[PDB]
Design a protein around this ligand. Structure first.
Ligand SMILES: CCCCCCCCCCCCCCCCCC(=O)OC[C@H](COP(=O)([O-])OCC(O)COP(=O)([O-])OC[C@@H](COC(=O)CCCCCCCCCCCCCCCCC)OC(=O)CCCCCCCCCCCCCCCCC)OC(=O)CCCCCCCCCCCCCCCCC
Ligand SMILES: COC1=C(OC)C(=O)C(C/C=C(\C)CC/C=C(/C)CC/C=C(/C)CC/C=C(/C)CC/C=C(/C)CC/C=C(/C)CC/C=C(/C)CC/C=C(/C)CC/C=C(\C)CCC=C(C)C)=C(C)C1=O
Ligand SMILES: CCCCCCCCCCCCCCCCCC(=O)OC[C@H](COP(=O)([O-])OCC[N+](C)(C)C)OC(=O)CCCCCCCCCCCCCCCCC
Ligand SMILES: CCCCCCCCCCCCCCCCCC(=O)OC[C@H](COP(=O)([O-])OCC[N+](C)(C)C)OC(=O)CCCCCCCCCCCCCCCCC
Ligand SMILES: CCCCCCCCCCCCCCCCCC(=O)OC[C@H](COP(=O)([O-])OCC[N+](C)(C)C)OC(=O)CCCCCCCCCCCCCCCCC
Ligand SMILES: CCCCCCCCCCCCCCCCCC(=O)OC[C@H](COP(=O)([O-])OCC[N+](C)(C)C)OC(=O)CCCCCCCCCCCCCCCCC
Ligand SMILES: CCCCCCCCCCCCCCCCCC(=O)OC[C@H](COP(=O)(O)OCCN)OC(=O)CCCCCCCCCCCCCCCCC
Ligand SMILES: CCCCCCCCCCCCCCCCCC(=O)OC[C@H](COP(=O)(O)OCCN)OC(=O)CCCCCCCCCCCCCCCCC
Ligand SMILES: CCCCCCCCCCCCCCCCCC(=O)OC[C@H](COP(=O)(O)OCCN)OC(=O)CCCCCCCCCCCCCCCCC
Ligand SMILES: CCCCCCCCCCCCCCCCCC(=O)OC[C@H](COP(=O)(O)OCCN)OC(=O)CCCCCCCCCCCCCCCCC
Ligand SMILES: CCCCCCCCCCCC(=O)OC[C@H](COP(=O)(O)OCC[N+](C)(C)C)OC(=O)CCCCCCCCCCC
Ligand code: SF4
Lengths: 115, 98, 175, 83, 70, 70, 155, 318
């Protein structure tokens, strides 16, 4: 109940501030005022055109490494077990394989952005 | 089988029907695969958490690990499709005839 | 009523699915999957798993952030489609909500519905356990057993993630 | 021993971050197998009573099981109070 | 001079002090002058819901000592 | 006559390599940049209190025009 | 009384606007160098509340510091148009006032006031950093005497 | 009395953010041999009040090419989520006492990124788009390092509860046993808050204003308020993580005063840094955290898993 009421208050305050912003001030809207900004000259093309990602390979690798935090975050609880020898072995094995993945991509020029 | 299982199982069916009806974008279909994994994760987590199946509590995590591998794999193929045709449209993937 | 919070969250969970299942621009489809991930975290979190709910939300927040970058690079057009700009998208969106309405309407009226399986509309709270645990979180103790019990799971997942990096470089090499 | 020292100096001059990384990781793998205190970590975890110690029905032939908590029999945590 | 920057830090510091102080004092007021009971695990929640019943006024922060046994 | 601005060969003795290793790992030359801006924080600013104070000028200053009389 | 209240509200918004002037980061020619020295430590325009911001959509003041040519004139009008109101223009220097040294050129606009409205004209070639600061404080006094709400109250 | 507690949190936060803008302009001023705001009010104490009123009585414009629903959703999401990251912070008593508070802040910090991506995309402007995709690169850069740095520290605390970090540092700050981790954590909060030298999503001198180039009036203020509420929060987090304060249950105010001073000093260091260094190229930020911090963080993560085991110093679960 408390958490939900705390969230409602934060996003209600955020919403009411936006509402005041649009209804309190005096507005004078015309075409040139709302045109897209490109430093003074009309944009040459649409902003919705394709935008090449030079770090696409590193972005895919982020998906795989971002799943290691899910597997690594239980470690504080894992250290409470009575099977410490097994737990410590698999904790280090899992982190090491995460490191070998980094080493492979680094050495194979995978972290270098495409020209 | 509480009323929550209805919506979760309906979410899976919606994402399955969404995956089997392509519009144009390969990326739009990839989202439906990630949507289906989300439904299975929620449905499995609910059953395991409700039955106090302690050791099964790691299964949903192992389900997300291999959902990322597939999602990353699907994105890698989407890069190569885009590099060959300039779009991710599925109608270009028709050089091979049945 | 707050007794139906889990059911109310599961309705939003479906509505988010109809958001990206109707397949508008992946920008808006990605937003729909974030809403479902957020409420899906809420639903799981109300059954006693806080780590699982927060984790799936955390993973899908980073998952759709990469998808967002890939949408501006490879899945974009001049007029990105919204749930109203296209009859096919709008048709599938309205259809999804109507089926959700009828299922929600019938389950809350009859307290039952029969579609493949038989569902009960008394409320999700009737199946909870009446006993307390000890001084620990059962979900946390099960997840922490991956390293003491799940030796075989750690190896296969660890190897899969390693090969996953090798594979994506091979697929995208182009030569 | 001369050519190997050249390799270490070369990496220490060009990748000091990596030299520290591998050195730190090497200690993580080696020291636990050598530390005499590693066995106590296992014992402390086993000595933490999460569950209830369900009593054993006394059949009259369990001399090593205490009848009362403050009896001499049973495991002792004297080592922990000094560790 | 530089110490003319201090008045802006003092106002900022007073603003950062209020949230912590207000929560500490509001908890005391809502729990009979005690810290709010922390219940991170079911055992602690089980004891808090037992305190409500024992109090006889449906409040978990109303303690009952030896005066309530006879 | 000319001079080189960036033609220097770093030392390779173990004490010089370790000094550069400490600089890389402990951010010594970045901490030194912090120390220079900290010094300015404790100097008197060069701002004048306009319009109550005016920037210095000279008799040759070329301002607004005027027609003079005998 | 209603006239008293609108008078005080007018004094409040007028105060807020003149105390938080945000010039657009916009300079054309030599006059922009003298505008840099007004941001330099000696004059420190930031202490009056005057802060440069690059986006025209977050600016309250345009300082036309330099020569305006026919090629640049459409750009100036565009960035002026993209300024949310209320917006004030300060014309700095002979070139921006009436063409200055280049009044009779085929490629120069004879005054920025042919392209945008101007609130304050700062003379000089260039005006000293202290002369531009006089124009900014003269603009603030102009805003202090606005009667937006009082004029509304008796419409 | 809970609603009063919420208001006694967000309202003081919005006041501290307002006067942090004053404090930054005066600290930047004196490190630049000038004064900063000293006219509007005595010593500039009314400058934040003048700026707030000016922005909220100015005209907001929706660009003709914008996607209105997302264009207006983004500023609401930014400020709504910047205030939500304060509710689990123990000062010394949290408003919301969470068993997984560290996880909660991670999850909210990843969701607050979309207030940048949707803001920049919805504006339908090239500079807003270039700014938005710099937030994708930035998040890819620090997210993995940030999470594993937290994990290494939590292996000495034993829990994800923020209030437990108070008990962990009852004898000594964690800056001593984890100074290498504190260095990387501090840099990762600079990247995570889009602060100089990692202010790339805005990048004034490159992208004019970056992801919020098209925002005006109140909607812009919400992004600015969210930005400055995050840096205070990320420094309160740092003070709790590495500069623990003693908690006397009979003098909960002494904790607040001492804890508030450290947070102010860490926040001042953000302004100190913004005055001293140039800006990274956003591809150089990716290589900083993947080729230097990640190799070290992985090594230190292994070290802190093993060090408690080999010394018999594993922290309690509860
Ligand atoms: C989490 C919450 C997510 C919120 C929903 C997503 C945002 C909306 C969206 O993306 O629509 C895009 C899409 C594009 O419409 P558009 O914005 O008009 O296009 C822009 C054009 O430039 C059109 O330009 P324009 O010139 O027409 O704009 C003018 C308009 C512009 O004014 C506005 O944009 C309205 C202001 C929107 C506020 C959004 C913030 C919401 C409140 C804050 C909540 C924060 C989180 C807490 O000003 C007006 O005149 C207002 C009256 C006209 C109605 C405007 C359209 C309203 C659509 C509904 C928005 C909600 O809208 C739709 O097609 C509507 C379909 C229904 C969308 C909702 C379902 C999506 C599925 C996922 C959600 C699952 C359910 C969870 C929500 C239910 C919870 C109980
Ligand atoms: C020589 O050759 C030439 C060039 O080459 C250099 C040129 O370039 C040009 C072209 C010239 C130009 C475009 C103009 C050049 C002029 C200059 C002055 C640039 C010179 C150099 C500078 C360093 C000037 C200023 C720039 C910087 C980076 C100084 C840093 C100090 C600052 C104060 C900037 C901003 C800093 C901070 C800390 C933030 C302040 C910002 C705000 C917007 C104020 C606060 C914000 C708010 C949103 C309000 C707060 C409160 C809120 C929101 C409400 C909260 C409370 C509630 C209750 C809600 C020409 C012609 C040229 O010939
Ligand atoms: C405000 C109140 C006043 C005090 C505030 C503190 C001021 C501290 C910053 C100023 C430091 C003075 C500048 C200086 O001497 O640096 C030059 C010096 C020397 O610069 P150097 O680059 O020439 O190095 C010389 C020696 N070699 C080359 C061999 C390395 O820099 C240092 O030695 C600083 C080392 C400290 C490292 C700390 C990093 C770890 C931090 C852990 C968490 C804490
Ligand atoms: C005292 C009781 C009381 O006040 O009512 C709460 C009441 C009663 O208190 P209570 O039920 O929450 O706690 C019990 C109190 N004792 C211990 C005495 C039994 O709680 C409610 O019923 C819900 C309150 C709804 C919201 C109340 C209004 C909040 C808005 C106030 C506006 C002013 C805020 C000023 C903020 C300043 C910011 C700088
Ligand atoms: C945007 C507007 C929404 C803001 C984002 C909210 C994200 C979900 C919040 C999850 C809260 C959480 O993690 O629990 C914390 C904690 C979990 O950490 P915990 O381990 O300390 O659990 C506390 C319980 N004990 C004391 C037993 C340990 O849970 C709570 O504080 C109370 C649970 C209340 C659950 C109510 C959830 C309903 C709200 C879900 C909204 C989902 C929509 C999100 C859409 C986002 C996309 C736009
Ligand atoms: C170089 C740029 C980066 C700089 C980053 C670091 C800047 C912030 C560093 C804060 C250092 C501590 C500030 C001292 C002033 C605060 C006084 C205080 O907290 O109480 C006295 C504190 C003691 O109070 P305490 O609550 O912190 O207790 C000490 C720690 N335990 C809990 C383990 C006992 O002592 C000092 O801080 C003296 C310095
Ligand atoms: C019960 C399940 C079915 C519910 C009805 C779903 C159909 C909703 C309407 C619809 O989807 O559009 C009709 C569709 C043609 O749509 P359209 O994309 O405009 O085709 C020409 C585009 N150039 O034409 C169709 O294919 C509709 C087929 C039914
Ligand atoms: C004395 C200080 C003790 C306290 C320091 C504590 C901090 C340790 C971390 C910093 C590294 C210093 C310790 C390494 C030994 C240093 C002393 C030494 O090397 O002997 C001095 C001797 C003189 O050097 P010189 O002959 O002039 O030229 C080098 C030719 N090989 O050099 C030699 O010729 C001997 C051979 C040099 C090459 C050996 C390999 C050195 C590089 C390996 C990496 C060292 C860092 C590893 C730890 C990383 C984590 C910090
Ligand atoms: C028991 C379980 C624990 C053991 C786990 C087994 C796995 C260990 C490895 C896990 C980490 C994965 C990375 C390992 C490979 C190291 C990175 C690499 O591949 O380097 C290749 C390197 C490429 O660089 P290049 O372009 O050729 O330019 C430099 C040329 N000199 O080309 C090179 O020149 C590299 C030269 C060889 C580098 C050797 C590195 C050895 C690393 C392990 C040392 C650990 C022990 C050190 C610490 C001692 C204890 C203090
Ligand atoms: C001059 C240079 C300035 C440099 C910048 C400094 C930054 C600002 C400093 C941090 C902000 C502190 C502002 C508040 C300090 C005084 C607060 C205080 O001690 O009050 C007494 C305290 C409880 O008082 P309190 O709860 O705040 O108010 C009553 C609410 N019913 O009860 C107590 O007695 C607690 C013990 C207090 C000991 C002091
Ligand atoms: C796009 C939208 C898709 C369709 C969604 C459904 C709309 C129609 C609902 C009618 C059903 C009805 O009459 O029931 C109304 C219920 C009310 O809640 P309850 O807890 O069941 O209270 C009733 C039971 N009492 C009396 C015991 C407390 O509504 C729902 O819980 C619907 C889910 C929330 C809406 C989504 C947010
Ligand atoms: S008015 Fe003078 S200083 Fe200014 S741009 Fe023209 S010639 Fe240069």
């Amino acid at each position: 109940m408390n958490l939900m009421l705390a969230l409602l208050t934060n996003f209600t305050l955020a919403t009411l501030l936006v509402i005041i912003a649009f209804w309190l001030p005096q507005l004078n809207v015309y075409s040139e005022k709302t045109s897209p900004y490109e430093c003074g000259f009309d944009p040459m093309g649409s902003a919705r055109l394709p935008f090449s990602m030079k770090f696409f390979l590193v972005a895919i690798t982020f998906l795989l490494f971002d799943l290691e935090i899910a597997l690594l975050l239980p470690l504080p609880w894992a250290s409470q077990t009575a099977n410490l020898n097994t737990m410590l072995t698999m904790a280090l094995f899992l982190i090491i394989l995460l490191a070998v993945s980094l080493a492979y991509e680094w050495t194979q020029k995978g972290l270098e952005w495409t020209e | 089988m509480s009323m929550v299982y209805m919506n979760i199982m309906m979410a899976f069916t919606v994402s399955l029907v969404g995956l089997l009806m392509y519009r144009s974008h390969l990326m739009s279909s990839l989202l439906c695969l990630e949507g289906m994994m989300l439904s299975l994760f929620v449905m499995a987590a609910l059953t395991i958490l409700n039955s106090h199946f302690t050791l099964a509590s790691m299964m949903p995590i192992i389900l997300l690990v291999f959902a990322a591998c597939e999602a990353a794999l699907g994105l890698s193929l989407l890069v190569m499709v885009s590099n060959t045709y300039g779009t991710d449209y599925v109608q270009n993937l028709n050089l091979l005839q049945c | 009523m707050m007794l139906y919070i889990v059911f109310i969250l599961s309705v939003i969970f479906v509505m988010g699915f109809v958001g990206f299942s109707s397949k508008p621009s992946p920008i808006y489809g990605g937003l729909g999957l974030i809403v479902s991930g957020g409420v899906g975290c809420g639903i799981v979190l109300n059954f006693g798993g806080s780590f699982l709910g927060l984790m799936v939300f955390l993973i899908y927040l980073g998952g759709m952030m990469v998808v967002f970058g890939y949408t501006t690079a490879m899945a974009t057009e001049q007029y990105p489609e919204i749930w109203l700009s296209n009859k096919a998208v709008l048709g599938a969106f309205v259809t999804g909500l109507l089926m959700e309405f009828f299922m929600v309407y019938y389950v809350l009226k009859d307290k039952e519905v029969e579609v493949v399986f038989e569902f009960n509309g008394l409320g999700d709270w009737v199946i909870y356990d009446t006993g307390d645990s000890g001084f620990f979180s059962e979900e946390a103790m099960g997840i922490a057993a991956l390293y003491s019990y799940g030796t075989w799971l750690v190896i296969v997942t660890g190897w899969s993630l390693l090969i996953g990096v090798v594979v994506i470089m091979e697929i995208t090499r182009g030569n | 021993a001369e050519r190997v020292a050249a390799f270490l100096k070369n990496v220490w001059a060009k990748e000091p971050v990596l030299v520290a990384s591998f050195a730190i990781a090497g200690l993580a793998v080696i020291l636990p197998t050598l530390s005499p205190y590693t066995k106590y970590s296992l014992m402390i975890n086993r000595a933490t009573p999460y569950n209830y110690p369900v009593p054993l029905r006394d059949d009259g032939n369990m001399p090593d099981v205490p009848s009362h908590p403050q009896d001499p029999q049973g495991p002792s945590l004297e080592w922990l109070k000094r560790l | 001079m530089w110490f003319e920057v201090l008045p802006g830090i003092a106002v900022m510091g007073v603003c950062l002090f209020i949230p912590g102080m207000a929560t500490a004092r509001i908890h005391r007021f809502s729990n009979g002058g005690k810290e709010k009971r922390v219940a991170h695990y079911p055992y602690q929640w089980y004891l808090m819901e037992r305190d409500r019943r024992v109090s006889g006024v449906n409040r978990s922060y109303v303690s009952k000592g030896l005066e309530n046994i006879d | 006559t000319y001079k080189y601005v960036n033609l220097r060969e770093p030392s390779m003795d173990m004490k010089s390599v370790t000094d550069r290793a400490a600089q890389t790992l402990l951010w010594t030359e970045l901490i030194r940049g912090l120390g220079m801006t900290l010094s300015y924080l404790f100097r008197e600013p060069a701002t004048i209190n306009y319009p109550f104070e005016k920037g210095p000028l000279s008799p040759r200053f070329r301002g607004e025009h005027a027609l003079r009389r005998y | 009384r209603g006239e008293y209240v609108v008078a005080k509200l007018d004094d409040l918004i007028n105060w807020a606007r003149r105390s938080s002037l945000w010039p657009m980061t916009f300079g054309l020619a030599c006059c922009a160098v003298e505008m840099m020295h007004m941001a330099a430590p000696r004059y420190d325009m930031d202490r009056f509340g005057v802060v440069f911001r690059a986006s025209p959509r977050q600016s309250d003041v345009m300082i036309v510091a330099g020569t305006l040519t026919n090629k640049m004139a459409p750009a100036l009008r565009k960035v002026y148009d993209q300024m949310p109101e209320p917006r004030y223009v300060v014309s700095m220097g002979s070139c921006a006032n009436g063409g200055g040294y280049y009044h009779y050129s085929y490629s120069v606009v004879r005054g920025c006031d042919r392209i945008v409205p101007v609130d304050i004209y700062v003379p000089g070639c260039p005006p000293t950093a202290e002369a531009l600061l006089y124009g900014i404080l003269q603009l603030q006094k102009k805003i202090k005497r606005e009667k937006r709400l009082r004029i509304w109250y008796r419409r | 009395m809970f609603m009063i507690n919420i208001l006694m949190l967000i309202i003081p936060i919005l006041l501290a953010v307002a006067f942090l803008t004053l404090v930054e302009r005066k600290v930047l001023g004196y490190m630049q041999l000038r004064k900063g705001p000293n006219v509007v009010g005595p010593y500039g104490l009314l400058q934040p009040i003048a700026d707030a009123i000016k922005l909220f009585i100015k005209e907001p414009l929706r660009p003709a090419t914008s996607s209105a629903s997302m264009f207006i959703l983004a500023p609401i999401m930014a400020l709504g989520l910047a205030l939500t990251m304060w509710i689990p912070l123990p000062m010394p008593y949290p408003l919301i006492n969470m068993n997984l508070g560290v996880l909660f802040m991670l999850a909210m910090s990843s969701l607050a990124v979309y207030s940048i991506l949707w803001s920049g995309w919805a504006s339908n402007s090239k500079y807003a788009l270039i700014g938005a995709l710099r937030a994708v690169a930035q998040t890819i850069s620090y997210e993995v390092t940030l999470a594993i740095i937290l994990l290494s520290v939590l292996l000495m605390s034993g829990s994800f509860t923020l209030s437990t970090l108070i008990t962990t540092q009852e004898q000594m700050w964690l800056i001593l046993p984890a100074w290498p981790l504190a260095m990387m954590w501090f840099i990762s909060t600079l990247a995570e808050t889009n602060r100089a030298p990692f202010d790339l999503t805005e990048g004034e001198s490159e992208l004019v204003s970056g992801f919020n180039v098209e925002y005006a009036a109140g909607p812009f203020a919400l992004f600015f308020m969210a930005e400055y509420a995050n840096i205070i929060m990320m420094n309160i987090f740092t003070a709790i993580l590495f500069l623990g304060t003693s908690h006397n249950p009979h003098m909960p105010e002494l904790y607040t005063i001492n804890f508030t001073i450290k947070s102010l000093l860490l926040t001042m260091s953000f302004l100190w840094i913004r005055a001293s260094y140039p800006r990274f190229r956003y591809d150089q930020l990716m290589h900083l955290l993947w080729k230097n911090f990640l190799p070290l963080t992985l090594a230190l993560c292994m070290w802190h898993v093993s060090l408690p085991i080999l010394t018999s110093g594993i922290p309690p679960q509860t």
